[PDB]
Design a protein around this ligand. Structure first.
Ligand SMILES: *[C@@H]1O[C@H](CO[C@@H]2O[C@@H](C)[C@@H](O)[C@@H](O)[C@@H]2O)[C@@H](O[C@@H]2O[C@H](CO)[C@@H](O[C@@H]3O[C@H](CO[C@H]4O[C@H](CO)[C@@H](O)[C@H](O)[C@@H]4O[C@@H]4O[C@H](CO)[C@@H](O)[C@H](O)[C@H]4NC(C)=O)[C@@H](O)[C@H](O[C@H]4O[C@H](CO)[C@@H](O)[C@H](O)[C@@H]4O[C@@H]4O[C@H](CO)[C@@H](O)[C@H](O)[C@H]4NC(C)=O)[C@@H]3O)[C@H](O)[C@H]2NC(C)=O)[C@H](O)[C@H]1NC(C)=O
Ligand SMILES: *[C@@H]1O[C@H](CO[C@@H]2O[C@@H](C)[C@@H](O)[C@@H](O)[C@@H]2O)[C@@H](O[C@@H]2O[C@H](CO)[C@@H](O[C@@H]3O[C@H](CO[C@H]4O[C@H](CO)[C@@H](O)[C@H](O)[C@@H]4O[C@@H]4O[C@H](CO)[C@@H](O)[C@H](O)[C@H]4NC(C)=O)[C@@H](O)[C@H](O[C@H]4O[C@H](CO)[C@@H](O)[C@H](O)[C@@H]4O)[C@@H]3O)[C@H](O)[C@H]2NC(C)=O)[C@H](O)[C@H]1NC(C)=O
Lengths: 196, 207
């Protein structure tokens, strides 16, 4: 039994739906039926949905149960238990740290190419639950990738977000904004601009 | 009962000719009534007998951990030689065969860009040096920092991220004191990849 936490961006963005996943493995053919009992801080709920079983290569079934949760509950540190084996996960306990957002312009050597990369460094935050978005002139970007949180030496986490845009746009003096959402932020939001 | 895990050699060991690459075969969940584990290594079918097996290791969950290490050649691993680890045990119905090799696919040369600290970060006593490595394949890579010949220690590298063009990218952040950066010292970002010239690429960064 494995109890996975909701996606970091799903617990911050109200437009998405955070889910707690309970993956059960090594299920026997003699006993395929698996009963799931979810508990939110003790109180038993019944709004969980179970996905159809999938036979693995090692002749075992893989039963997965999904429980949709609220954004406020997880952020406040609600205790979620999965009774199959009784696993239990929750929000990362510990003193929250404010992230430091730094936007970085493309390297001079990258100007030789047709497309440049915009860098947004976010460091010194806790916990690792975070969401990063890019936007330009109000309209959001789509061609960007963000690295998973990395545990730094001081106990906090950090990551990077790379936006790829045409060199023409960057040379025309356009303004790109790096949006960061985190628990220990004012209004759970911080933004930094970047232009030539 | 017992499970077998075959680990690939360190990326920097297969590229640096001074280091020694080795394929590790880790066996867990070994019964106390049968700690006898047989290892059989095969290189593209041909069985080798130069492996070095370490004695058993008692774990906290009342199980043993037998580890077999096989040193390999740099040219062999890079050419895509297939390495097989046959594990035999009395508690096993049939010998378990795990098999690993170099990640198949056409190699791509990584592009290394060093980025100076932000202006806002200059307020702090510790600034961050950024190294961007993008457009490489496969994900097997190694990144290191150095200054004045001597290597740095206070840095961290993000795991490779699959980009939109099918290639991988990552970042490496070096944390130095602002006094060093303002003194005019030079910091270099060392990158080791199989698609690079002499499997090495380095870019410098200074104020
Ligand atoms: C009894 O205890 C032992 C020992 O565990 C220890 O004791 C217990 C009591 C606890 O306290 C533990 O916290 C403690 O560690 C248990 O043995 C464990 O068994 C599990 C499996 O059930 C193993 O998990 C695997 O881990 C590997 C990665 O292992 C590296 O990283 C670990 C930290 O992340 C580290 O602890 C390991 O030592 C090892 O470290 C690496 O070592 C090599 C060489 O030694 C070195 O070169 C590396 O640099 C170094 N790396 C690091 C980070 O240190 C993980 O890869 C495995 O994932 C595979 O298997 C999964 C299914 O189990 C699957 O989901 C994955 O996708 C992946 O599957 C493979 O994927 C590859 C592609 O990548 C594919 O090619 C393969 O075909 C595919 N194979 C399969 C089978 O799917 C896996 O998660 C633990 O490592 C192991 N512990 C140790 C110390 O080895 C034992 O289970 C306990 N018994 C009971 C009954 O509970
Ligand atoms: C029969 O086969 C089953 C299926 O295994 C699969 O098929 C085989 C052929 C191989 O391809 C495997 O690679 C593959 O997984 C086995 O089930 C597996 O059991 C093992 C443990 O027994 C599980 O390993 C555990 O993995 C956790 C992380 O799992 C995520 O990441 C995986 C990739 O890294 C991904 O494959 C998983 O699906 C899962 O992905 C996440 O899913 C959630 C929910 O859907 C999402 O929210 C996330 O975003 C996903 N993340 C992604 C996509 O990156 C580890 O966390 C876990 O570690 C913990 O336990 C170990 C001990 O087991 C500790 O040492 C460790 O410290 C830590 O506490 C563990 O490694 C594996 O995930 C299971 N497979 C699947 C598909 O879930 C059966 O075990 C096997 N039966 C027998 C008898 O062998």
């Amino acid at each position: 039994v494995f109890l996975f936490p909701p996606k970091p961006e799903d617990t911050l963005m109200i437009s998405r739906t955070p889910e707690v996943t309970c993956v059960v493995v090594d299920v026997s053919h003699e006993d395929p039926e698996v009963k799931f009992n979810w508990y939110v801080d003790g109180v038993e709920v019944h709004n969980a949905k179970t996905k159809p079983r999938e036979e693995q290569y090692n002749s075992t079934y893989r039963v997965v149960s999904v429980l949709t949760v609220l954004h406020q509950d997880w952020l406040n540190g609600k205790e979620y238990k999965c009774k199959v084996i009784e696993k239990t996960i929750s929000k990362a306990k510990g003193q929250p740290r404010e992230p430091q957002v730094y936007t970085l312009p493309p390297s001079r050597e990258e100007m030789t190419k047709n497309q440049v990369s915009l860098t947004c460094l976010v460091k010194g935050f806790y916990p690792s639950d975070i969401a990063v978005e890019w936007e330009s002139n109000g309209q959001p970007e789509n061609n960007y990738k963000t690295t998973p949180p990395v545990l730094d030496s001081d106990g906090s986490f950090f990551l990077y977000s790379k936006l790829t845009v045409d060199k023409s746009r960057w040379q025309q003096g356009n303004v790109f904004s790096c949006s960061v959402m985190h628990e220990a932020l004012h209004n759970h939001y911080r933004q930094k601009s970047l232009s030539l």
